[PDB]
A paper describes a structure:
Type 1 rhodopsins are heptahelical transmembrane (7TM) proteins that covalently bind the retinal chromophore and use the energy of light to perform different biological functions, such as ion pumping, ion channeling, sensoring, and kinase activity. To fill this gap in the current understanding of the proton pumps and to gain insight into the evolution of rhodopsins using a structure-based approach, we performed a structural and functional analysis of the light-driven proton pump LR (Mac) from the pathogenic fungus Leptosphaeria maculans. The first high-resolution structure of fungi rhodopsin and its functional properties reveal the striking similarity of its membrane part to archaeal but not to bacterial rhodopsins. We compare to our knowledge all available structures and sequences of outward light-driven proton pumps and show that eukaryotic and archaeal proton pumps, most likely, share a common ancestor.
Here we present the first high-resolution, at 2.2 Å, crystal structure of a light-driven H+ pump from fungi and elucidate the functional role of the N-terminal region. The crystals belong to the P21 space group and comprise two protomers in an asymmetric unit. LR (residues 42–286), all-trans-retinal (ATR), 19 lipid molecules, and 65 water molecules inside the protein are clearly resolved in the electron-density map, whereas the N- and C-terminal domains lack resolution for 41 and 31 residues, respectively. The LR bundle consists of seven transmembrane helices-TM1–TM7, connected by three intracellular (ICL 1–3) and three extracellular (ECL 1–3) loops, with retinal chromophore covalently attached to the K270 on the TM7. The interior portions of LR and HsBR are virtually identical structurally, and the only major difference is observed at the extracellular sides of these rhodopsins. In the LR structure, the retinal chromophore is fixed in an all-trans conformation. The protonated retinal Schiff base (RSB) points toward the extracellular side and donates a hydrogen bond to the w8 molecule. This arrangement is stabilized by the RSB counterions, D266 and D139, which are counterparts to D212 and D85 in HsBR. Consistent with the prediction, the LR crystal structure contained 8 residues from the N-terminal region (residues 42–49), that aligned with ECL1 and belonged to a 3-stranded antiparallel β-sheet. This N-terminal β-strand strongly interacts with the ECL1 loop and is directly involved in its stabilization through at least 7 hydrogen bonds.
Residue numbers in the entry: 42 to 288
Amino acid sequence: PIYETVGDSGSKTLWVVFVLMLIASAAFTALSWKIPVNRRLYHVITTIITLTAALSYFAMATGHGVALNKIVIRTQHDHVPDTYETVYRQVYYARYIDWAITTPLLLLDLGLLAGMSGAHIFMAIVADLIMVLTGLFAAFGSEGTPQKWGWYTIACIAYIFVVWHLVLNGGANARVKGEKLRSFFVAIGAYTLILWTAYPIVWGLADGARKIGVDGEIIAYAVLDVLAKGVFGAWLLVTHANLRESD
């Protein structure tokens, strides 16, 4: 039986992201002290996002939130019956708990920015929570059974409704707020679209086909997480300071 588990480069990367998330949380706090308490909504939401990711990466960095998945791989043969091999791959379910907190809050950030209504923000979060939930089912679905790729596909469809809702309703609502806000929303929104779209791709390469090892999976999620939480947040909060249209 072959094992696929964290290596040295993966272990260090987890600690790096943990430290990067704390720093972003500190910078965002430092920015928030430059403005009155009543106007700190975005900084509070965005700082909770990076703190949650810090709590998550700290847990994975010290070996928590990980399960060993046993995978049996059936090989077909010409004249001989099928042979079997057994792989044990770490699955970092800590991410599905993190994403269940941070992706709704990211979507709160964008919905507040666009001026979506509370009912519409709520709808995006329902679809988003179905995505990360069925993502978790797919992560524990047995290979060769319908539940693995079937729950994955359901998650992808819930993801498509997120995009569809925010494009149409976030996009129509940002129009009403003027050109400077609308341009910013479209630019940070399009950035988000590209980044979030990469997560199911990493999943297919990792959980799906196991074309990349655990180390490669960890480094890919690290880039995306940093870009989707740290850079995203620094962009939104700095722009907000200079854009009263965001308030």
